[PDB]
Design a protein around this ligand. Sequence first.
Ligand code: ZN
Ligand code: ZN
Lengths: 370, 550
Amino acid sequence: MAVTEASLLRQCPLLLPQNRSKTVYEGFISAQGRDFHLRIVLPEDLQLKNARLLCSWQLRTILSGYHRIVQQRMQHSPDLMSFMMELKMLLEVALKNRQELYALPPPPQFYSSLIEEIGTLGWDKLVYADTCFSTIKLKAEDASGREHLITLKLKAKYPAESPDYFVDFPVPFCASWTPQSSLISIYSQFLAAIESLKAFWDVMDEIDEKTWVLEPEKPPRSATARRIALGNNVSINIEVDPRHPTMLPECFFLGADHVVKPLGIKLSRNIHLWDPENSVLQNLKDVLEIDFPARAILEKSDFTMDCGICYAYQLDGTIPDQVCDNSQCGQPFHQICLYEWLRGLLTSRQSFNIIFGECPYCSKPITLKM
Amino acid sequence: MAQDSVDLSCDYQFWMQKLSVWDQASTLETQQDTCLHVAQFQEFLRKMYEALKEMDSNTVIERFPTIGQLLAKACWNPFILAYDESQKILIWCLCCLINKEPQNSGQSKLNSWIQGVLSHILSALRFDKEVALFTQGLGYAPIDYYPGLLKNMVLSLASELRENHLNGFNTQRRMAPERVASLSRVCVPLITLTDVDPLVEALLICHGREPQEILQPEFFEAVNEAILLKKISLPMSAVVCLWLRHLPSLEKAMLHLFEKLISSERNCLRRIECFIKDSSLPQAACHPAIFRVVDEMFRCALLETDGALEIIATIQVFTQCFVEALEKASKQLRFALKTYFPYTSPSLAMVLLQDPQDIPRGHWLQTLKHISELLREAVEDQTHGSCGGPFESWFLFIHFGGWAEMVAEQLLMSAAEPPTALLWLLAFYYGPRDGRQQRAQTMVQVKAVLGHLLAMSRSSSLSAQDLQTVAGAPAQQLIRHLLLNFLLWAPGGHTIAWDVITLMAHTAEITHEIIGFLDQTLYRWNRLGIESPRSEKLARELLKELRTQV
Ligand SMILES: [Zn+2]
Ligand SMILES: [Zn+2]
């Protein structure tokens, strides 16, 4: 209702006014099926500019951080009713964020059904389960003999709503979930999607075997790009379409302007000779009319010696000179890029011509002297 | 000799009651309001100038009632007196009201008042006190330090903005966002003042971390307008960031390209190429966000007309500029072509990107014959994992000039036994979304027409009526254009071109269309470096004379 005579009853039922002059309320306040203790005190008059509000330690740890907002709302809010509406909203938010600490599943259905279902799959499948039992991860095989993992994240009510499925492979995976469905169902759909993309996989497997793939180093299964190296200090990057892998790829050239140009010309002349019945390599070799090196250098690949902020060599005469003091990063930078970055971060502090801060990549102490 | 007073006597009262509301813009709301209306005020003063110039002072009393109050109110408002020409005109109006030989005291008082207000404009010390005091001692007049002070004032401000940008999420000294908006409003009336340009470029590059827009859209529009008339000359990074923070400004800029291809410079592709390269759109369109929105305005125009040849050519020019700038300035880590052209198979684009400068003139046939095959697959065999439809694969193919126009000329070069796949490509060009029955009927008509044309070419120089027989619909523009390509190609041309052109140019639309066609063709030839000087001179003369009919 509008007035605070029946609306306050209806919208905060478990707040009971103690005093006849309705000034002290005490009781509980509700949020996502959970009641929090709360005790409020007004002045002699109905002004919230000054009021007491005490809570249980349950409620304060959950309204941790938002303390200043609530304190502000005490002073800014006109009526008590609206202040409570706002505090229930606010409370909902603070709970929905830290949903990790605050939950309880319905065991009689849940834990047993999930273990029945993992038995229905087969214990050869399951590879990981989280202590909250929320995330689990299963495995499958290709006919080619490739492992593909699938992460599910489960809610408090597993069979009721959909579980969030996360998978590596590059086409979007679609799983028809029903309330009747279960882990065997989505797993069968996953095996179907695996067998669909077999051809893309074959392509990328053949490439990563018989060629020096360069910068998807140890590439994922999501990865469509393969910067292949050829000759010396020149590369061709190659993006492949999953639905049509054997089809012509997107390819272009990085390196020396004088070496690449005749290659682009030869490509232009031979592109009509592309054929999606052979292999990608077996087509590219006769299209660009050259052979590849099979790992010409395995040790000293092109360790990226670029700014790791601007990703360029040769920024305004400057060289990547400022580096990381770390064995695992060793990442060069520029003065200018790394100065504009460190002057940003909140952690950084500046002496006379020195700034100490965190390396962007590894977050270790790095020093810059202008 | 119609109004001479009425519209102006209304505007007078409007402006005078508005100046009274405004004066001196010492607040927020007077400022925003002045910056809006000022442009019209300028025109009003030009008309007022014309009115007072033609007549004389001190004799006539038409609007002499309140001209004084108007010019005063104007002068003490500095957002008026700093706009493009307002001050110069305001001087003029007071110069007209002066009198050489005052008789009544009113004329002398007026002249004195005029000297007073002029002196206020030019030479009044409304500045800080101690700085005024310091200079007189050193023997400096206002003029010979005003410039440095401004310059040194501007640089200061620019640094502060520069520093506010780097202090993103830092415990110090946040430049109060009120002052940034204030500066943005103050730069607007004086954007054509060269001395401030340093401030603009800093305001646009120093976006800040505030999630709301701290600058107000009166500012973006002024900069945007002024980039396009070439009255400010910023650097490219500034305009790219203006485009990327204010999409309605990129619409108003890409519309200013469509007026360039519709009104002013119809079918002069050299002036369009010059405009596009000089404008920054190609450089700015390396950003995928701006190419998806610039491409969406081209599509809207491609649909409003049902495939106007004038739009197509502009798109071809744009795409050629864009390509060598995507290429030019992204060495490592560039965006993948399915990100600019996200609907088609990337394969197809990767083919159509290959410039025909790079290919021998003889191997163009093979490349086209291959493209045709892959396009036929993409349209007719419309299965999952392909285009959205025929229109999309079309709209791609349209972006790449060179390929689309060489088709007819290669059919003529291989006129004996034309390849059906090329016939398919050509028929597809002039109409997609037809269905095989239509495309087949069109193709067989075209093949018969090609049979007629090879016979006619290997014959002597014949009439134009023999051509109107086979010409004699939904498939007219294809046959028209093929016949024009025949005229330019065959050496039987340059004798009987006029005879066909006059008959074909029924309306003005077909004439304009043919002009456009010929311009596109000469641009294309001169670009690809493919030329037969017969056709060059022929087309130039025809274009010259057809530009007269309009
Ligand atoms: Zn750098
Ligand atoms: Zn590091």
